[model samples]
Structures are given as C-alpha cells and as structure tokens.
Target: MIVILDNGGQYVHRIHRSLKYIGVSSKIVPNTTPLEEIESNKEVKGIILSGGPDIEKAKNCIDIALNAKLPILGICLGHQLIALAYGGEVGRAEAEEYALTKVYVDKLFKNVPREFNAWASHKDEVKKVPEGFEILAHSDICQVEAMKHKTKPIYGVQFHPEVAHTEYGNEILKNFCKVCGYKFE
Candidate 1:
C-alpha cells in the first residue's frame, strides 16, 4: 500500500481515486499524522505528499521527507516542501501557471511523453532544487517543474498529475507505483 500525506490539497481525494483506478492500494493520512504511525505501517511501500493551499500548513511533512526510507512523490506545495527540507529555495513565481501547461520532461518513468500538457496551479514555486536532486521536467513558467533525488526514490512535480486535465496522468501515477516495486500490468 502507498500512503498519501494529506496536506489539505483541494484534490487530495482525486489522488486516491486515481491510484485505485490504476489498481494500486492506497491510504490517506493527515499531514499531522504522527511519524510513528507511518513508519510502522508495514504495508506501505511508498508515500505521496499532496498539494496544499500554502506552506505554513505543512506540518511534519519535511520530517517525513527527511526521515522516511520509502519512496516519495510530492505534488505542488508538497514539492516545495521537499526542496526546502533539503536546503533548496522556493519563491513567488515569475508567471503563475493556472492551467494545463506544456512541459518538456526528459525523465520521469519509462515511455512517458518527452513533452506533454500537465495541470498546474501555483503561485509560489520551487526556484532551486535541493542538492543531489535533478530537474526532471520544466515549463515556460516554472524552471523546476519536476525533480527527484539522485539515488533515492524521492520525486516532486509542480503539476497535479492526478487531475483529469493532465495528459497521461494515470501513466505517471503508475510509473510511481512501479518505482515503489509494485506488480501487475
């Protein structure tokens, strides 16, 4: 099972629904859920940090990102938190993206489009990725659209791939599950 850290995102349930559509078992936990509970969840192989309204509401998310051993995939505000936890920077966007934006993605998972449209809605964005992480995708508005750790199974994306508007959204989620060592086609 993959555990989702609910950071008060508007579309948090959509993420769970999308995972179910892909046949992946998932559980949603509040951002404030104690770290002990998640760490002791033997069924959980990975974590998904959902987007939120702002950064202040993020409680113990950075702790999870820093301390957890399982794979992690962060979206929007969650993305910024991962960057911040690892000594990166987040700031106001040069141009706030509020729709489906075209992006060039070199690496995310096998067979994902080199370029595709993704749902994006953010004012503050990741300006610099943390050390040991690489840029996975970029758009005209956000430089650090997507990123992941060099050797760890940690990832972040500025877009909401769980939403209907993102092109190949399901595939992205499936790829993440694959990264978590899940089985089944």
Candidate 2:
C-alpha cells in the first residue's frame, strides 16, 4: 500500500483516485505524522507527498525528508520538502506557469521516454539542487521538474502526474515504484 501524506492541496484526493484506478491501494495521512508512526506503518511500501500551497510554512517539514526506509514521491510542495531537506533552496518561481507542460527526461532512469507531458501548478521552484542529487527532468519554468538523490531512494517532481492531463503519469509512478521494489497487481 502507498501512503499519501496530505499537505492540504486541493488535488490530493485526485491523486488518491488516480492511484486506485491503477489498481494500487493507498491511504492518506496528515503531514504532521511522527517518524515512528511512519516507520511502523506496515501497510505502506511507498510514501507520496501531496501538493500544497506552501510547504515552507508547515512546521517540521524536514522530518518527512529524514525518512530513509520508504521510497518517497513528492509533488509540488512535496518537491520543496525534498529540496529544503537536502541543502537546496526553494523560492518563488522566476516564471510560474500553470497547465500542461512538456518535461524533458533524459537520465536517472534508463530507457525512460525522452519527453512526457504533465500538469504543473506551483509558485516555488528549486533554485539549487541539494548535494548528491541529479536532475531527472526539467521544464522551462521548473528547472528541477524531476530529481532523485544520487545514492538514496528518494525522488521528487514539481509536476502533478496524478492529473489526467499528464499523458503518462501513471507509468512514471510505476517506474518509480518498481525502482523501489513495489509490485502492484
């Protein structure tokens, strides 16, 4: 099962719905969940950080980043959490653009598609990637549209793949989960 850590984004339910449609079971929990609780949550194989207006405003946002056991998938504000946790900075996007956008993916995952469309809605972007992390994909507005820690299991994306507008968001999630050793029937 997957755990969706809610950060008060309007589309959080949409994400849960999309995962269900793909035949994956999932649950939602508050972002304030304690680390011990998260670690003991046996049903969760992967954790997804839901999009939010401003994760910077949330207290103890860094705790979620310290988790090492569960593979993480951050969306929008969730992406900011990964950045802030790993020595990167998050600030207002120099040019924030909403709607469908093309993200160019070339590395981080072999044989992955070169280009994929995804839904984006964020005011902040990662100006600097944390040490030991590499960019997986990018767009004009969000340079770090997707990234993964070089030696860890963490992953992030500024776009919302859960939205229907994204052409292959489910496939991307599947790939990430596969890398983390999740098998959805």
- Computed on alpha carbons, the lDDT of every model, listed in order, comes to 0.88, 0.79
Candidate 1 lands at a TM-score of: 0.96
**Candidate 1 C-alpha lDDT tens digits along 92-112:** 885565698888986654667
- Highest lDDT scorer: 1
Q: Estimate, for each residue in 1-185, the C-alpha lDDT of model 2 and write its tens digit.
A: 88888888888998888887777778888888776787786777888888887675654556777655788888888888988898898888854556888889847244457887788965888889999888989987678889988888888888888888887888777776676566767
User: lDDT of candidate 1 vs native?
Assistant: 0.88
TM-scores of the models, in the given order?
A: 0.96, 0.91
Clashes in each model (backbone N, CA, C under 3 Å)?
0, 0
Worst 10-residue stretch by lDDT in candidate 2?
A: 106-115
* Cα misplacement distance, residue 81 of candidate 1 (Å): 0.6
How big is the positional error of residue 24 in model 2, measured in Å on the Cα after superposition? Answer: 1.2
Tell how far residue 177 is off in model 2, in angstroms. Answer: 2.1
